[PDB]
Amino acid sequence: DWEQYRDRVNMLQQERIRDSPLLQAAKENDLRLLKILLLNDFQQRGAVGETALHVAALYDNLEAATLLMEAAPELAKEPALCEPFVGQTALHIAVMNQNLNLVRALLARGASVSARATGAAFRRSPHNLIYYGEHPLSFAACVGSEEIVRLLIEHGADIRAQDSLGNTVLHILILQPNKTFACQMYNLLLSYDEQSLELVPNHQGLTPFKLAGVEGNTVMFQHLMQKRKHVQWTCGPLTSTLYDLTEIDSWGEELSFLELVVSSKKREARQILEQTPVKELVSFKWKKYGRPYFCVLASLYILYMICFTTCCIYRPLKLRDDNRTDPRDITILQQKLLQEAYVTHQDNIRLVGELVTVTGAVIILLLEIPDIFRVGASRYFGQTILGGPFHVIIITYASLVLLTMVMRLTNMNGEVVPLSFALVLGWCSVMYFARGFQMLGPFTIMIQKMIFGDLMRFCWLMAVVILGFASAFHITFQTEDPNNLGEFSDYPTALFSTFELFLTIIDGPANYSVDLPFMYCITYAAFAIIATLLMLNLFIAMMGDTHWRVAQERDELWRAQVVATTVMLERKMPRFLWPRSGICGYEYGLGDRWFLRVENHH
Amino acid sequence: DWEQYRDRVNMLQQERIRDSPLLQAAKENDLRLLKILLLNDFQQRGAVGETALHVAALYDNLEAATLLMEAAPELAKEPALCEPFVGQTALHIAVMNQNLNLVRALLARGASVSARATGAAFRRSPHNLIYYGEHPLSFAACVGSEEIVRLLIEHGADIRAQDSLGNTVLHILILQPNKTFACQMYNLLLSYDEQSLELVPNHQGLTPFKLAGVEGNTVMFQHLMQKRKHVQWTCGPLTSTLYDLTEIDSWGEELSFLELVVSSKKREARQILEQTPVKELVSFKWKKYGRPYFCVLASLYILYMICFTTCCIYRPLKLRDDNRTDPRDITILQQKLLQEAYVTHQDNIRLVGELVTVTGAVIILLLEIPDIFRVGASRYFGQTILGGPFHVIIITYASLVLLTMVMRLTNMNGEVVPLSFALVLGWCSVMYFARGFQMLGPFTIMIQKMIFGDLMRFCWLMAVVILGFASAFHITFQTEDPNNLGEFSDYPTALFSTFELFLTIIDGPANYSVDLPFMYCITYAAFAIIATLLMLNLFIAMMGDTHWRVAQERDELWRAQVVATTVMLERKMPRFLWPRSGICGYEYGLGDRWFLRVENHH
Ligand SMILES: CC(C)[C@@H](C)/C=C/[C@@H](C)[C@H]1CC[C@H]2C3=CC=C4C[C@@H](O)CC[C@]4(C)[C@H]3CC[C@]12C
Ligand SMILES: CC(C)[C@@H](C)/C=C/[C@@H](C)[C@H]1CC[C@H]2C3=CC=C4C[C@@H](O)CC[C@]4(C)[C@H]3CC[C@]12C
Ligand SMILES: CC(C)[C@@H](C)/C=C/[C@@H](C)[C@H]1CC[C@H]2C3=CC=C4C[C@@H](O)CC[C@]4(C)[C@H]3CC[C@]12C
Ligand SMILES: CC(C)[C@@H](C)/C=C/[C@@H](C)[C@H]1CC[C@H]2C3=CC=C4C[C@@H](O)CC[C@]4(C)[C@H]3CC[C@]12C
């Protein structure tokens, strides 16, 4: 376990500090015994691998630290050695504690300004509570001190230093939860930059602009957009602003800014889409091109669904050759063969309809299966922003249509099974296009939240109630005639009848001409009290609570779904139908950049 | 597109400012190169059509503006020429920026005080963020400056100047969203008025009083009612106020104040009906005359509905001459002819009842069809204040009754179709009279909001669910005997049965004497989980959320419906049954005005 190993490391470090007298005197700033010991091994290390100067920097002992840098000047260069803190120097712990004079004394003794703390306690992990980087400059930028940052820069710290994750100091500053003073430190560190430091990619390929978009740092995004705007004029309450769309539109890039924002796992990333360039950019993209193309694609999919349904209704069936020996058997028709089916003109119309259906199912798999590999199977099917479960049911519908096609070509009986699954899933996949409308999109998201929410727990306890009462009903009617009351004659029939009686979609089985057992009456009274009266209306109460508790999240989810649909439509549709958004700067002498003009009222 | 043209105009204006050195020096207030250029074309124009003095007034450059009015005194008279800003002078941009000394210097050089900015960026449009008028006096009244208003008036600006929309400066002041300081500017501009400026109509025929009523400017209405009130006395906590009803009652006018207020498309116009004269005026009108007349009209309509229903029940039917050849055919009666029907005394009673029904349907079309033309088909049927959908179903009911009348006179079979539509619509039109009661009016409005709200989206996804499961059920029972389970024998029958099974108004089809396919069991279990359990109760949860989220709007909608019903009853009923409201001033020597007395407690 990671917690037990870190706990053992911490108590071992404290124990080896306690056993060593030099480490103890560096811990509680005991000057007298320090002078006695330094007058009388100075490079002894603890369990972490740290020196006594590390202990003095850890416990904020300035006098003790100056004492052992006077006695041992080389002690200000050695880092810790063992795994959880390897690379940590005394400069790192002095910078973390914001001790200005200790940092000055360490830099006077020869502390490295580019020491890399590559330990496991400094990586960006859920194990670590903080992620301040690996360099002392990143640590000083993240603790919140200006003066140690200027001191480290004037002593020769690399501003463009990258850690093991590839993050520069700008990336680590953006990854902080302060979100307000990090802009001041960003301005301070950009003052010393004058390629740019703002265009140095991450190991994930992210600029600091793209990292601020992904992590949902809205204040940092607004601060970054100040340097990319230009106020054209201000006339009274009206002002015209010219936002740069180079980093935002990301034309020609395989992974754009908006694609990374709408496919981010953070809940705060959807608030980037409501900012001052981005909201009107995606609104213009949706109003001018996204909505009509989504509407005609929805119309084409509805026509394709109508064609598939009409091919399902007119499927080839012949009269059953085998006689109905069993009285309970009611099958009078059976499937036709390959040569027996397509012999008429209506069969040729159904043939071209089925060819259109198979062509549409192949086209569906040519558009979805590449999209799993570009993003990932966890994000393509798990993110409701991109249309997660809808892609699952669409891929399943295409697979079932191809299974029915090879069933037809192989002449296997039982086409009704994949045709029924394909019909239900393909028709329920038309709700994917509901996200393009304000009337239906939030309701579809609420359906998605209720299916994976209240319905799952309700069905989980419903299985228990239905199993118990179905077993009780089946053992109650195990001694009676199944002709007079056949709801509980067989145990699967008892389970189905009890499920239907819970949902009250069938009547309570009562035959007044005969004498039912009293155990059925008592068990069904309890079933009607607990299942019908209590549980079926408690589901309505629970969904009524959960409906108003997630309505705001539902609206923001729908807005981000509209933006992600716009991004998907711009990525997949041809370029000649999706012109580049914004105003071209080459027509007006502003270089090769594209801008978006916003006129606001203050 | 209007946004792209305005964006191109703005970037072209900035580009032509950037290319020209005179426009550039007027932009960033470069005095040195300005003196060099003026010592060395001065009337050059940009893309907008503006001079360099326009640029100096736009970028608030006082010294630059004084420089080119010293060099070119005629430059302070030329307006912009091209379409989006035609008529805009430098005085307009100086007034917009609230530059007092620049306005003084322009007026010293000979700037026109009555320049009309007839461009497309100054009209009252949703394209423009502001509507400040076309004259510099309206601009100075709307930016919020007293001093430039007094300066422009003392320099000879017309206070009664009207723009292309016909609005005076009072109208444009009322159309501002400040709503508090606009009263101070209204008092300032009325101080210089002393026909009155307050009685100058709009091109829509509106006074500033009527414009404040239409736009829902409640603070401006309260400020306007201070000049039309008169405190008779004040005795302790009791004070008696005498409000003038000349502008409010609008006796003799075809388009009154209250009719314009209740038929306004703004949501804030319904708050005018709660103000200090208007609320008690419409309350006295409703309590004294509106409620009893509405009650007796509702009673007459209920009696007419009873007569029409009784004529529908006793309709002439004869025994079917053709034999029932088809076993499924159950039609045993058919319609009588014209000469065959009215042969008895009960047939004569039904004849006079049907004549009363046709007379009522003709009277209905004589009262509604004129009212569409006076207001408009979008507002008569779209505004729930006036009874929008109720007029639609009433006109449809009258049309269906006349269609049944010509069907009877033409002897066409199939009267049951328009008689069924007419019965349902005419009986559901009795809910129009529910607005006169506190118990039923808000509930009727909530029904209207739920029909066009949650029910529409629920039915839109319900069509998808029912279509998919109906197709699955029909292909499941395509091979079985239709005698033992005929719910899904035909595809329209499968669609109807699946809709009924979703709403659980029929039982789940189960025949325990025969063996149903397992695909029906799996598909119906999924149908009962998704449609019956999830969706049918999620509709209740969604309507429970939407009920409490619009309840206040429901109450205000009902109050405005009561006021609009009072206005309609006063307009349509004869004058001898609706006496003029208020206290006549001729009986007490106060001229020919009518007043309403309000006694309040402070
Ligand atoms: C007998 C078979 C056909 C079984 C497996 C039935 C499955 C259907 C009824 C279920 C399986 C997964 C379901 C499902 C998953 C997720 C969503 C997203 C939501 O926003 C709209 C509804 C929607 C689309 C629903 C509709 C109902 C579906 C499609
Ligand atoms: C608890 C949740 C997950 C819901 C969906 C479960 C419902 C159970 C009670 C339902 C769903 C599918 C049903 C079902 C499907 C098909 C058949 C085949 C039929 O010839 C005998 C009954 C039988 C075996 C029934 C029994 C009851 C089942 C198992
Ligand atoms: C088979 C036919 C008769 C079809 C078309 C039925 C239509 C009826 C049921 C529908 C059509 C329009 C509906 C309708 C529209 C608007 C309103 C306003 C609301 O505040 C009260 C209910 C009311 C009055 C409802 C009642 C139900 C009506 C009248
Ligand atoms: C989705 C919303 C808008 C609601 C109202 C739609 C409901 C559908 C499922 C209903 C409404 C009217 C129904 C309907 C009306 C009349 C007939 C004639 C009958 O001889 C065969 C069934 C048939 C054809 C059914 C089929 C199911 C329909 C089409």
Author numbering:
A (entry chain A), B (entry chain B): 28 to 67, 71 to 224, 230 to 637
Tell me what the authors wrote about this structure, in their words.
Transient receptor potential vanilloid (TRPV) channels are a group of six polymodal cation channels subdivided into two subgroups by their sequence identity and functional properties. Here we use cryo-electron microscopy to reveal the molecular details of RR block in TRPV2 and TRPV5, members of the two TRPV subfamilies.
To determine whether RR occupies the SF in the apo state, we collected a dataset of TRPV5 treated with 1 mM RR, yielding a single state with strong density at the SF with a C4 symmetry at 2.96 Å resolution. Indeed, the structures of both TRPV5RR and TRPV5PIP2+RR are essentially identical to TRPV5Apo, including vanilloid lipid densities, apart from the density for RR. We also observed two possible positions for RR binding in the TRPV5 SF, a higher one which seems to be preferred when the channel has not been opened coordinated at Asp542 and a lower one coordinated by Asn572 which is dominant when the channel has previously been activated by PI(4,5)P2. Yet RR is not tightly coordinated in this position, resulting in somewhat amorphous density. It is not clear how RR enters the TRPV5 pore which is tightly closed at both gates in the TRPV5Apo state. In TRPV5Apo, the lower gate is tightly closed and hydrophobic and the SF is also closed, but provides a favorable environment for the entrance and binding of the positively charged molecule. Therefore, it is most likely that RR enters the TRPV5 pore through the SF, suggesting that the TRPV5 SF may not be not as rigid as commonly accepted.
